[PDB]
């Protein structure tokens, strides 16, 4: 969790809080319309350069910013394939309820497992000095959950094995 992820976590925090200087901006190709500019990528003069934060080859933090919208996709550790399946299913459930989260994408960008997307409106109404707090909190708690759920798998396997075998 922490006491363990200081430099990576603080680098992500600083980069995210620096990249969240959004602004209301309409569409330069369609009139009377405004769209998240990071997702469309049609006007390159307002798209800041993509930025990547990493701690190890299996952990990355792609930070793509724009004038109004910021997309922030991360990779979390999957040491063994058990954690691979657990991470995939858990993060699918996480993104399946993006309606009540307001900063999630229903489908992550390829080569990743989750992609946040903070449009202007979220910074407009929701005070954003704890969106990053939620970000880092999730980035550590997710590994916590994966470990706990694999423990629960082992426990249930033990219980069912005992229940089956005792009734000879």
């Amino acid at each position: 969790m922490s006491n363990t992820l200081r430099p990576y976590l603080n680098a992500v925090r600083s980069t995210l809080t620096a990249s969240l200087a959004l602004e209301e901006f309409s569409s330069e190709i369609v009139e009377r319309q405004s769209q998240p500019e990071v997702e469309v990528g049609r006007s390159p003069e307002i798209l800041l350069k993509p930025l990547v934060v990493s701690r190890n080859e299996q952990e990355q933090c792609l930070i793509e910013s724009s004038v109004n919208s910021v997309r922030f996709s991360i990779r979390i550790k999957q040491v063994d394939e058990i954690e691979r399946i657990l991470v995939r299913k858990f993060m699918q459930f996480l993104m399946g309820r993006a309606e009540s989260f307001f900063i999630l994408r229903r489908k992550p960008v390829q080569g990743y497992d989750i992609s946040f997307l903070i449009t202007n409106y979220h910074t407009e109404e929701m005070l954003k000095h704890k969106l990053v707090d939620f970000i880092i909190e999730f980035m550590e708690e997710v590994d916590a959950e994966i470990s706990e759920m694999k423990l629960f798998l082992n426990g249930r396997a033990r219980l069912v094995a005992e229940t089956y075998l005792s009734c000879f």
Binding site: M1, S2, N3, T4, L5, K77, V79, D80, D143, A144, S147, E148, K150, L151, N154, G155, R158
Partner: protein, 372 residues
């Protein structure tokens, strides 16, 4: 690698930290407790299970179960929960980035060792791990190389004589009387004065009573005769309920169970006779040195005046021509940890790990043929 993990997963208490440090970063009771009521409240963050210090603090509405019984883990689910707690909630370091050192009592079933190694390698994916005996750790901590070690803890008491750099596995004596049995006997003999302790919370309270009041006398008959004129021996304790209880001859009676195991109805030698037999089982040429080096270790050996009485009994048993000396450092409560850290911070120890690449190519039986 900068530092290596090390965890003393003892039966009653668990000690964890980094190799080379001189202070336990994390010590919490090895307790996993589940609620036993309804919770008509709303919210409150209903947590399914509380482990460690949280369970010790909220024992009012919880039932506590020790995963390790008599040094053998019996609830692997609770053991995994405790290891997860140590890794994430208190030390909060990723297991996959730190080799770990574990401790297991001698003469335990091989199933315990194999299962522990497999769990650490697969469920936690540690880089490397090692399993060591308590007596070797005690010798490492004390700075000695020769001397029989008495390791009395919460779960089991064992003796492992070790000459200069060599251990005699055939002279290892293991006794299943320990702090938990002493606490149970104290609970049983506190009933004769009226006070009754039943639930696990009462068991922890009695453990605190034994912590703060129990001590070992010098001569049992003389101490009982003195207690007959019960004038200047009784003490008082304050329960959390606020009621004050008085303690008497049972203040020192229950520590004597170590020296007279017949008190709890078990036919075995005391912690002095077992040491004498363990020394006599060794070669004759090394007894003259093992007598001079008696090592006290573990939490149970923290009773006041236990060392003096044990020295008296061993001197009585042994011939008078050769002197008997017993040693007990004031920090012997964490002697096992100190030895473990000293061993883990040794350059010559770097090639004695068990790496994952070594483990997966030989199965979980590799621990038997490498660790010990």
């Amino acid at each position: 690698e900068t530092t290596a993990l090390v965890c003393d997963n003892g039966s009653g208490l668990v000690k964890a930290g980094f190799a080379g440090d001189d202070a336990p970063r994390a010590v919490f009771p090895s307790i996993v407790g589940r609620p036993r009521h309804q919770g008509v409240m709303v919210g409150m963050g209903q947590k399914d299970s509380y482990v460690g210090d949280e369970a010790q603090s909220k024992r009012g509405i919880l039932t506590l179960k020790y995963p390790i019984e008599h040094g053998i883990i019996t609830n692997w689910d609770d053991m995994e929960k405790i290891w997860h707690h140590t890794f994430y909630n208190e030390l909060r370091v990723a297991p996959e980035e730190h080799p770990t050192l574990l401790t297991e009592a001698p003469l335990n079933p091989k199933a315990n060792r194999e299962k522990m190694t497999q769990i650490m390698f697969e469920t936690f994916n540690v880089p490397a791990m090692y399993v060591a005996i308590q007596a070797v750790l005690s010798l490492y901590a004390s700075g000695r190389t020769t001397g029989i070690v008495l390791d009395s803890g919460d779960g089991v008491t064992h003796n492992v004589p070790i000459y200069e750099g060599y251990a005699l596995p055939h002279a290892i004596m293991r006794l299943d009387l320990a702090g938990r049995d002493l606490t149970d006997y104290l609970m049983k003999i506190l009933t004769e004065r009226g006070y009754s302790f039943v639930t696990t919370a009462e068991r922890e309270i009695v453990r605190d009573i034994k912590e703060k009041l129990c001590y070992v006398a010098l001569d049992f008959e003389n101490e009982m005769a003195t207690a007959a004129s019960s004038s200047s021996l009784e003490k008082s304790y304050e329960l959390p309920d606020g009621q004050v209880i008085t303690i008497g001859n049972e203040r020192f009676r229950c520590p004597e169970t170590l020296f007279q195991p017949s008190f709890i109805g078990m036919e075995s030698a005391g912690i002095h006779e077992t040491t004498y037999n363990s020394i006599m089982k060794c070669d004759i040429d090394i007894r003259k040195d093992l007598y001079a080096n008696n090592v006290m270790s573990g939490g149970t050996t923290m009773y006041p005046g236990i060392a003096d009485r044990m020295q008296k009994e061993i001197t009585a048993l042994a011939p008078s021509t050769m002197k008997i000396k017993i040693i007990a450092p004031p920090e012997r409560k964490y002697s096992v940890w100190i030895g473990g850290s000293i061993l883990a911070s040794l350059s010559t120890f770097q090639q004695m790990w068990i790496t994952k690449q070594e483990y997966d190519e030989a199965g979980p039986s590799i621990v038997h043929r490498k660790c010990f």
